[PDB]
Write a protein that binds this ligand. Structure first.
Ligand SMILES: CCCCCCCCCCCCCC(=O)SCCNC(=O)CCNC(=O)[C@H](O)C(C)(C)COP(=O)(O)OP(=O)(O)OC[C@H]1O[C@@H](n2cnc3c(N)ncnc32)[C@H](O)[C@@H]1OP(=O)(O)O
Ligand SMILES: CCN1CCC(N(C)c2nc(N(C)CCC#N)c3sccc3n2)CC1
Ligand SMILES: CCN1CCC(N(C)c2nc(N(C)CCC#N)c3sccc3n2)CC1
Ligand SMILES: [Mg+2]
Length: 411
């Protein structure tokens, strides 16, 4: 059933994941010296290429591949259109390893045929709370705690094969080469997410959407008009009213994040994230990189009253190409990123996210039910979509956890 995934150090069935009680590696210990020094073999008509993610033109080439060939819905209505600026942000965080970004090109014209990207993340991925308790009850605390220390691992994203090369077993080759490059740097685990079900997620969450421009969302068939709106003389007018938001933020002291806020934002974020079983650890440089405002890419606001930062939220932009509509060709989506609330309820913090995103011309706000995202779904009028995000580890046995015990946002 899985000619590639059956050969890999991942849990092979749901049952297996159901049985795991302690975090830890799946494969035997290996050294960098054990890993092939030469690139994985590839057909003579292709070549491995390491793009330079800082160089505008190489980012452009990757941008074009993804624009035309990255994830689309099953009805081929929307395809992600991550921007060049977003891709430089996502793929070159502090201390990134250039060699972890892997492409295939056709040797003749050098047309870009495939890509996958790894970036460093420092992740807490030891045994979850519910399982450390079972371990205490059984006299097995030492085993349960062995891997408690945050680990420096690889986060994988942006796997893409050109549509003309689909179903040719190229993705397994790209994954093997990426694994080799990561292993040659003495890293042995990865974390990744996908919409599709593969062997085997340690957590799964539904996507939620909050309409900001319902007229446009209905026009492009992102949204339908719920049946009960047909009871109205003007179904669309009622839908627009339903989703109306204030034109200015409500929280006293909300303002954009600035560099001097990095230590305070790191503090309150780290205190909050600590409470979840799986979550990242960020340095000041990583807080700066992932949270300071960048035009068109990431938007971050703090609540400062009386000279202290007590709360913050962030969102990022991923537009999608709208493929077959007469009136629009772009969907402008805002995605809930990290946040932390200490002075106000989370719903009150995130309402100002929606207000700001709507003011800035976003059409929808998206999120997965990770973190405490479920705590403001109903009041703030999010609805569940039909999609899910599944969370996976490579070479890491991990108990099944609920998505509200995951604190890692994946771009
Ligand atoms: C220690 C370091 C480790 C580093 C590596 C960690 C692992 C990272 C793993 C990657 C995490 C990526 C996270 C993201 O970016 S998820 C986003 C993935 N990208 C897209 O969906 C974009 C549009 N689609 C495509 O570009 C292609 O259809 C892709 C490239 C997805 C597959 O190309 P293609 O359609 O031409 O197929 P093939 O003949 O070459 O290969 C078929 C094999 O591929 C398995 N497959 C299909 N979809 C996925 C998928 N999303 N993750 C993992 N495996 C996938 C499939 O089950 C089959 O294996 P098996 O069922 O036969 O066994
Ligand atoms: C069946 C009803 N649908 C189908 C479309 C669904 N949406 C918005 C959606 N939208 C997608 N894209 C690319 C736009 C995401 C946004 N915003 C993708 S990419 C893979 C699945 C998928 N699904 C949700 C509503
Ligand atoms: C591989 C990592 N990511 C993480 C984010 C994924 N995104 C942005 C995403 N993915 C969606 N789905 C349904 C998962 C698609 C995939 N893979 C949806 S439905 C509405 C917005 C939306 N957005 C694209 C794939
Ligand atoms: Mg292929």
């Amino acid at each position: 059933a899985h000619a590639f995934w059956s050969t890999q150090p991942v849990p092979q069935t749901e049952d297996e994941t159901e049985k795991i009680v302690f975090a830890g590696p799946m494969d035997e210990p290996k050294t960098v010296a054990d890993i092939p020094e030469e690139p994985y073999p590839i057909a003579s008509t292709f070549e491995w290429w390491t793009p330079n993610m800082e160089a505008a033109d190489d980012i452009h080439a990757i941008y074009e591949l993804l624009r035309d060939n990255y994830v689309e819905d099953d009805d081929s209505m929307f395809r992600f259109n991550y921007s060049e600026e977003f891709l430089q942000w996502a793929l070159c965080p502090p201390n990134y390893i250039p060699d972890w970004h892997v492409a295939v090109r056709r040797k003749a014209d050098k047309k870009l045929l495939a890509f996958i990207a790894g970036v460093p993340v420092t992740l807490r991925m030891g045994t979850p709370k519910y399982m450390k308790v079972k371990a205490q009850e059984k006299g097995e605390g030492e085993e349960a705690a062995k891997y408690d220390e945050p680990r420096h691992i690889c986060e994988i994203n942006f796997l893409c094969v050109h549509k003309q090369l689909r179903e040719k077993r190229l993705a397994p080759i790209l994954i093997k080469e990426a694994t080799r490059r990561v292993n040659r740097t003495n890293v042995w685990q990865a974390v990744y997410t996908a919409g599709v079900l593969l062997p085997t997620p340690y957590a799964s969450g539904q996507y939620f959407h909050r309409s900001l421009n319902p007229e446009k969302l209905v026009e492009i068939r992102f949204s339908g008009i719920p049946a009960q709106y047909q009871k109205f003389q003007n179904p669309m007018a009622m839908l627009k009213r339903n989703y109306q938001l204030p034109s200015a933020p409500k929280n006293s002291g909300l303002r954009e994040m600035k560099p001097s806020d990095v230590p305070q934002v790191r503090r309150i974020l780290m205190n909050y994230l600590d409470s979840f079983d799986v979550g990242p650890v960020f340095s000041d440089a990583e807080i700066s990189h992932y949270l300071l405002p960048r035009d068109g890419v990431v938007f971050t606001y703090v609540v400062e009253n009386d000279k202290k930062v007590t709360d913050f939220f962030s969102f990022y932009r991923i537009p999608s190409t709208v493929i077959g509509n007469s009136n629009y060709n772009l969907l402008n989506a805002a995605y809930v990123h990290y946040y932390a609330a200490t002075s106000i309820p989370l719903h009150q913090l995130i309402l100002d996210l929606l207000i700001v995103a709507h003011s800035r011309g976003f059409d929808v706000c998206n999120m997965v039910e990770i973190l405490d995202n479920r705590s403001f779904v109903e009041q703030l009028k999010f609805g569940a979509g039909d999609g899910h995000l599944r969370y996976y580890f490579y070479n890491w046995a991990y108990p099944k956890i609920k998505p509200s015990q995951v604190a890692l946002v994946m771009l």
